[PDB]
Structure formats: C-alpha cells, structure tokens
Ligand binder design. Structure first.
Ligand code: NA
Ligand code: NA
Ligand code: NA
Ligand code: NA
Ligand code: NA
Length: 444
C-alpha cells in the first residue's frame, strides 16, 4: 500500500562549510577550505564560506522549514575546527552548537545523520602535514571519540567520511579541492590514511557499544560505460571504474586494494603503504553504506597516458554541472553493491540531486521543473531497487538549500530551497513542494 514503508527515511543533506557561515565565531578557527578559497584562482570569483547560508544563526528556522516539509531525517556534517580549534584543545562552545542543532532536530521528529568529516580539516592539522601525515589517524580518532561521547545521546547514525575520493584524488592529484596538490603518489597515500582514519573511528565506536547506534561511510560512486565494444575501450572503462569506485569499495568490503589498480598506479607512483594490518583496520564491519550518486561516465581510450580516458558526450540531457541525467545507474549501482560488495547490508542514498539555472520569477516562485523531473526519475529507480529486494533504508536529497559548491562557489544551486544570499531569505522551490507530497503520500 506504500511504495516507501513508514520506516523508510526521506531525508535532505548539507555540509558544515557549505551552509553554516559564522566562520570566525564562538572559537572556530580556519579550515583548509577557508584558506583555499582565499588563494587566487582556486574558487569561483573568490567566493568563500564566511557567511554561506548563515545556517549557524538561522538553524531554528531551517529546522522548522524541514518539519513543515515533513522531512524524516537530516544529514549534516560536524566542523572539526569548531570542536578542536587547536591541536588537543577542545572547544565546548563548538560542541554546544551541535547539541542545540540536534536537540532541535529530535524535538521536531527528524532523525540526525552526522558526517564526522566533510572536508573542513582544521588548518592546524594541515600545517602538520594533514592527510599525508599518518599521525592524523590519532587526531581524527580523538575527534571522533569526543563526538561519540558528547553526542551519543543525540545522534544514533554516524558517517565517518564523506567522499574520500574527493579528499584524496580530487584534492591531491587533480588539485581542484583543498589543499590543491597535484601529485599522484600523495593522493594515493592520502586515500590510505583516510581509510585508516575511518577504521580507527570504527574501532573506537565498537568499543563504546552505544545503544541502538550505527556507523557507516559515504562514497561517491558512478557507473562507467565503454564508448565501444573494443578491447581498448574495455580497458579504459576498467581503469576509470577502478579509479572512482573499486579503489575504495575493495579495501572497505574485501580487505584488499584492487590488484589491477595497484599494478596500474605502481607504474607511476609508490604503492608501498599497503600492508595487512592496515587493511584489517580499514575493512572492519560497518552497519550501513552511504551512496552518493549523480551520474555515469562513458569513456574511450586516450593516448596511453596516466588516467587519460576521453570523456564521451552521449548526447543526452545534462545538468548545469555538465553531468548526464541517467537515472538507471542509480539502480545499477545499488544492485552492483548488493551482488558484489554489500550483499544484505543496509544501504542509504546519502546524496542525490541536481544543479539547474534557478530563478525566482515575478510570482516569487522557483519553477524548477527540471529538478522535479530529475528527482522523480531517481526516486522511481530507488522504488524499483526496493521492489527487487534491495535493502535501501533511506534517501537524502542533496541539498536542503542552495549553498557553497566548493570550487564553483555559489554559482551552482543544488537546493530544493532557494537561498537569496543578499537577505538570506529561503524560498521553497517547486521541487520542495513535490518532495513534501512524496513524503506525505509515500507514492510515486
Ligand atoms: Na561556512
Ligand atoms: Na575568498
Ligand atoms: Na562492512
Ligand atoms: Na544500519
Ligand atoms: Na537512465
């Protein structure tokens, strides 16, 4: 009688640096993204998150907005530089914000899902080497343990890391994200130290044995298609799939990095950080996997260089990111996990959404028909996965509100709510009204 059971979680998602603002208030010190956004050329028009959506001050209005939409769960991240603004220096004023935020959520019948690390590493940690320094495993563990102990009565659903592919390859090899290095060997070591840090938090979590509490990780996953049936394009797709997906799925769920990628990367950089003890910590059993899904890739062999597959445009509709709208890959990825990696383990879609050219019309509305249709198509694939026996427990739309989209600044709008940054006014887009109906009727 319901396409989505009463227990299924309809959610929305944000991240601390993208929405909070108050970047210099109540003891917060700089993150690597405060620093990166002030470096010339790194972020669109030198945008930064000084103010962002001002959610730090407006959170009660924002929670009331979610309650009026019927939101059942809220995924947010916790800012390490508010909690430990200096090495070993706990900031109770920072913790107090997340207590009042999550108290507000619970009292409005919204389940909190907390991401421990969503890219806002404290500058003091980066100045000590950051994710390249294996000591970060202990700093991150201390941070995670403090969150579990102070917030365990408030939060029962924990995500260690958001999108470690971005924190490693996009931040240290491609250089689009903070701290902006361009060195394959560095990105590979960072990927390992991120996974090891995840493992340390899971070890700490299990030792605490918090009542009715669950822990997972969030991975951005795609599906890779070869442009043709040629052997050249088949190898290109295998490499692209190993680079985005298997480099993280295999150590987490198989306890081994993908050997084809170890050998491939080993032609270009050191891969000597791999060892049995570390992979045992990395692959500890999780309670759930969070999947961030946006698009697929169609790839053709390049010129035998490092990770140089040519991106093919198959001619279909795209978002303002240039990302193909291809909802079938949401189902294909969830099924792949069910058949190859996670089996019967609970899955959540921890992000899915789209950037379009949103305008407030003279009627004061945002008629984002393309986002309505985008979300409709993807929720229909989530329903199809459920009806084929998939263990999907919830779905978080990225994002609750328009926000600071990293190197794009405020120029890309992902919200189901529009933000007028001059006034910080929130305007429900038509997609928010559609989602409110989906939650109320549980029908699609
Ligand atoms: Na911010
Ligand atoms: Na700036
Ligand atoms: Na697991
Ligand atoms: Na679970
Ligand atoms: Na499709």
């Amino acid at each position: 009688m319901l396409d989505f059971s009463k227990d299924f979680l309809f959610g929305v998602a944000t991240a601390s640096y993208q929405v909070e603002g108050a970047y210099n208030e109540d003891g917060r010190t700089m993150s690597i993204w405060d620093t990166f956004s002030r470096q010339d050329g790194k972020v669109y028009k030198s945008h930064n998150g000084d103010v962002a959506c001002d959610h730090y001050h407006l959170y009660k209005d924002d929670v009331k907005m979610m309650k009026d939409l019927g939101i059942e769960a809220y995924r947010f991240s916790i800012a390490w530089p508010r909690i430990f603004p200096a090495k070993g220096q706990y900031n109770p004023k920072g913790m107090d914000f997340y207590k009042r935020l999550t108290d507000e959520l619970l009292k409005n019948d919204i389940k909190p899902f907390a991401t421990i690390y969503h890219w806002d590493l404290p500058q003091w940690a980066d100045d000590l080497g950051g994710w390249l320094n294996r000591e970060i495993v202990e700093w991150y563990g201390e941070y995670a343990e403090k969150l579990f102990s102070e917030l365990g009565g408030y939060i029962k659903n924990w995500i260690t890391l958001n999108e470690p592919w971005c924190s490693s390859f996009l931040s240290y090899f491609i250089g689009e994200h903070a701290p902006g290095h361009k060195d394959l060997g560095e990105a590979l070591l960072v990927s390992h130290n991120l996974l090891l840090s995840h493992g340390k938090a899971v070890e700490i979590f299990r030792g605490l044995n918090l009542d009715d509490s669950k822990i997972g990780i969030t991975l951005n996953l795609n599906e890779v298609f070869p442009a043709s049936d040629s052997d050249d394009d088949k190898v290109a797709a295998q490499i692209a799939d190993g680079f985005q997906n298997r480099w993280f799925l295999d150590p987490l769920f198989k306890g081994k990095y993908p050997q084809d990628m170890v050998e491939y990367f080993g032609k270009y950089a050191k891969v000597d950080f791999i060892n049995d003890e570390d992979l045992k910590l990395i692959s500890q059993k999780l309670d759930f996997l969070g999947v961030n899904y946006y698009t697929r890739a169609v790839v053709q062999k390049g010129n035998d260089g490092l990770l140089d597959a040519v991106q093919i445009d198959p001619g279909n509709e795209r978002t303002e990111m240039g990302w193909e709208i291809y909802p079938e890959s949401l189902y294909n990825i969830l099924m792949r996990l069910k058949r190859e990696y996670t089996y019967d383990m609970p899955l959540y879609i921890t992000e899915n959404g789209a950037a379009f050219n949103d305008v407030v019309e003279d009627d004061g509305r945002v008629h984002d028909e393309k986002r309505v249709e985008f979300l409709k198509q993807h929720f229909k694939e989530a329903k199809r996965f459920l009806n084929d026996g998939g263990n999907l427990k919830g779905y978080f739309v990225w994002s609750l509100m328009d926000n600071f989209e990293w190197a794009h600044g405020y120029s890309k709008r992902f919200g189901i709510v529009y933000v007028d940054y001059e006034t910080e006014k929130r305007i429900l887009k038509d997609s928010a009204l559609w989602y409110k109906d989906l939650i109320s009727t549980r029908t699609i």
